[PDB]
């Protein structure tokens, strides 16, 4: 039936979901995730939205402030609102599935509540598409693709230009923090192709 979700776990506990439409598929996914890693996901949720202090206290206030200061929630929400029905079904299905399990958990905690919730003194709550989206956003994006040290870089360059003079300073900066190095081993061989762009390495923006 269109409303059937089969969950088969293999000999290592790995779940395989079987479903007809999108929402049902990711509902199954969220269901099993809630089953296997509920505490992990709850804390990951708090990590990515900066609500760790709410349960762990004062030592995480700075961590929380830093998280919220590194993204714009409304922008994430607007992206979700613009999603087509099919894509939304993914995040909505995943959320709903987690909620189905969470509901069973908060109904029979004496047997279903992961011990950590008891240990850390709280209980799990419902998830919305935003929450699911933010797990990915908060880890993959705001953390693994959000690297820069340009301010420190300029400090270094400045210090180098003061030490070695303007021309030699710039040149030393291009010695310690080169833009490109042609001897760098590349995943793609030179016979195949090269990157066409040439970039300024004189900080001409000043």
């Amino acid at each position: 039936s269109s409303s059937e979700i089969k969950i088969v776990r293999d000999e290592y506990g790995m779940p395989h979901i079987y479903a007809n439409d999108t929402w049902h598929l990711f509902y199954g996914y969220g269901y099993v995730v809630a089953q296997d890693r509920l505490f992990q996901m709850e804390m990951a949720r708090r990590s990515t939205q900066g609500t760790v202090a709410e349960v762990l206290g004062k030592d995480f206030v700075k961590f929380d402030k830093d998280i919220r200061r590194n993204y714009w929630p409304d922008a994430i929400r607007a992206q979700i609102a613009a999603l087509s029905p099919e894509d939304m079904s993914i995040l909505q299905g995943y959320a709903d599935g987690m909620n189905a399990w969470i509901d069973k958990v908060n109904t029979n905690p004496e047997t279903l509540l992961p011990k950590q919730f008891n240990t850390f003194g709280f209980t799990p709550k419902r998830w919305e598409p935003f929450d699911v989206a933010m797990i990915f956003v908060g880890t993959m994006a705001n953390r693994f693709s959000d690297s820069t040290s340009e301010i420190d870089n300029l400090a270094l360059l400045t210090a180098l230009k003061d030490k070695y003079g303007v021309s030699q300073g710039m040149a030393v900066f291009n010695q310690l923090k080169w833009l490109v190095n042609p001897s760098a081993p590349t995943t793609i061989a030179v016979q195949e192709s090269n990157y066409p762009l040439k970039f300024n390495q004189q900080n001409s923006q000043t």
């Binding site: 790995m14 890693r37 992990q40 804390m43 011990k115």
Partner: protein, 557 residues
């Protein structure tokens, strides 16, 4: 994170082999989540970090996919002009534009709540640091506004059945990530995906730019510009966060470089060593790279040149001879505490001394610190992540290469001293330091090995488990937090594809209220330790034949 894709021209007893090892540190419960999806156009198996809707490591029986962080420069900082008379505003294109702002309140357990404001401009969120009455920096991501698209692209890509369908998805993934492709026919591919800015002429992407408007990005580069290759002549695709392509610029991080010295060579070497590799051999590369000291190969020739004219009895001489006989492959002694060979310790002490004498000596404080690490630094719990050649080491490498290096040595890191002399002085410090600690008989030196820890706190430093749930592994291994391998058209199987992975500690992180740990809470921990792996099923028949449990839900949206 590493990855090697072996194509038809180099695959033995198969047509394509993909071995991927994302490295984000080690955690309990597992960093990734094993999942299989079948329906709604999907038919996949694999595992994925934090159970993202889309599988970052998996296959669909026709093609397979993986990733490693790209470390391209997709982030620039804009120096915004503020006015004390116009709080909340900034100058952009001749007009004082109102910033975006929002109130946040940090609820604090057993503490007083804390409210503050977050500020954003057309360039991105305002940084907290380096603020003055007249300046504030906004961090600009080329992927800004494309977070969901990347999430969805990572999901839809699982439905691809060929290079074209797949790259179509890769073109929508906006984060700086290396994507890799392999298929049943032995085709292999690579795309350094992501949104990259089309910068104004004269823009040095390593330094901040004024936010007043004249330096704004023109827009984003097209997919055409993204480094990519399909079925390379080499017959393989190998990456360990090294450069994607000649002339491709790296992340602006001062501590990150793509130069002559790169750990990916450790992989290239093993793949070129054999004309063809089987699945077992390709898998073995994990074991080898995880134990390979990354500095021996870089500095040994220098160490040799400097000591070639010394007498046998010179201790500096024997240190190098010790290194010369070594393959750099660390192995634990029977005590499960020390390394069979003292090479990494020798290299560490020497390298540390060389950097202090060279690079560190040429850089003004306090920036000098950035170049002092040898890359062996660690705690009692062991590395929190992968091991790499340090930035200082990479800079030093260019210097010991002399004219062979394409990087002009604007300043001599050896300050007019013969390199040999500096290298010899460092060898002397090494022998002094080590001989005084381990004695004068090198052959019985039992130096500390690094251990590995599956931490209870996630990479954010936030608890994702009780402290007690931390797991330990005697031997540190410079390998993926998880490792998965897909082999297409294996000749010894009746399946058009085979796949394996390892999700340590286990699929489940569940512990019942009474403390009863789940049956799949730790059943992959030993497997991880011994470079083992378990099968990933895909077909209905395989899943059925390996079924442990079942459950059927009936629900209406």
């Amino acid at each position: 994170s590493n990855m090697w894709v072996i194509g038809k021209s180099k695959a033995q007893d198969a047509k394509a082999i993909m071995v991927n090892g994302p490295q984000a540190g080690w955690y309990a419960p597992a960093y990734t989540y094993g999942i299989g999806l079948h329906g709604a156009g999907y038919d996949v198996t694999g595992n994925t970090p934090f159970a993202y809707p889309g599988l970052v490591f998996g296959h669909n029986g026709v093609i397979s996919w993986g990733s490693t962080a790209g470390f391209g420069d997709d982030v620039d900082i804009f120096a915004e002009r503020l006015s004390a008379e116009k709080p909340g505003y900034y100058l952009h294109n001749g007009k004082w534009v109102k910033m975006l702002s929002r109130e946040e309140t940090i609820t604090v357990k057993n503490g007083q709540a804390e409210t503050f404001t977050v500020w954003r401009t057309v360039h991105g969120n305002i940084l907290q640091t380096d603020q003055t009455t007249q300046t504030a920096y906004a961090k600009s991501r080329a992927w800004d506004g494309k977070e969901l698209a990347s999430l969805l692209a990572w999901t839809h890509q699982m439905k691809a059945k060929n290079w074209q369908e797949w790259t179509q998805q890769a073109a929508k993934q906006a984060l700086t990530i290396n994507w890799y492709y392999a298929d049943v026919n032995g085709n292999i591919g690579y795309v350094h995906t992501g949104a990259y800015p089309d910068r104004q002429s004269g823009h040095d992407p390593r330094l901040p730019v004024p936010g007043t408007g004249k330096w704004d990005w023109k827009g984003l580069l097209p997919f055409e510009m993204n480094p990519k290759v399909y079925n390379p002549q080499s017959g393989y695709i190998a990456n360990w966060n090294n450069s994607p392509q000649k002339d491709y610029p790296a992340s602006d991080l001062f501590a990150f470089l793509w130069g002559g010295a790169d750990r990916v060579t450790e992989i290239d070497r093993l793949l070129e060593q054999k004309p063809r590799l089987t699945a077992d051999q390709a898998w073995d590369v994990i074991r080898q790279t995880s134990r390979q000291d990354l500095n021996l190969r870089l500095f040994l020739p220098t160490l040799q040149a400097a000591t070639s004219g010394l007498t046998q009895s010179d201790p500096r001489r024997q240190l190098v001879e010790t290194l010369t006989r070594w393959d750099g492959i660390n192995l634990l002694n029977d005590d499960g505490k020390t390394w069979q060979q003292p090479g990494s310790a020798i290299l560490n002490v020497w390298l540390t001394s060389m950097l202090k004498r060279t690079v560190v000596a040429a850089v003004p404080m306090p920036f000098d610190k950035w170049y002092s690490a040898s890359g062996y630094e660690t705690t009692q719990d062991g590395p929190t992540g992968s091991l790499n050649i340090s930035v200082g080491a990479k800079i030093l490498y260019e210097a010991v290469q002399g004219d062979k290096s394409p990087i002009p040595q604007a300043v001599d890191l050896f300050a007019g001293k013969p390199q040999q002399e500096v290298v010899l002085a460092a060898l002397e410090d090494t022998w002094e330091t080590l001989s005084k600690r381990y004695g004068n008989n090198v052959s019985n030196w039992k130096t500390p090995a690094m251990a590995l820890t599956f931490r209870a706190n996630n990479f954010f430093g936030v608890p994702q488990a009780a402290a007690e749930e931390t797991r330990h592994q005697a031997e540190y291994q410079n390998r993926g937090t998880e490792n998965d391998m897909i082999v297409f058209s294996p000749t010894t199987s009746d399946r058009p594809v085979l796949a394996w992975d390892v999700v340590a500690p286990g699929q489940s992180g569940f512990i019942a209220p009474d403390g009863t740990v789940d049956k799949h809470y730790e059943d992959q921990l030993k497997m991880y330790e011994n470079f083992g792996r378990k099968s990933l099923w895909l077909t209905k028949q395989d899943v059925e034949a390996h079924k442990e449990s079942q459950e059927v839900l009936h629900v209406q949206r």
